[PDB]
Amino acid sequence: NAXXXXXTFXXXXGLXX
Known part of the structure; x- marks a missing residue:
């Protein structure tokens, strides 16, 4: 589960x- 922000x-x- 990647993410948790911006990129x-x-x-x-x-x-x-």
């Missing part, structure tokens, strides 16, 4: 990323 992947949170 090149995107924002918010979610699995895979």
Whole structure:
């Protein structure tokens, strides 16, 4: 469960990323 903020992947949170 990656995320928990902002980054090149995107924002918010979610699995895979």
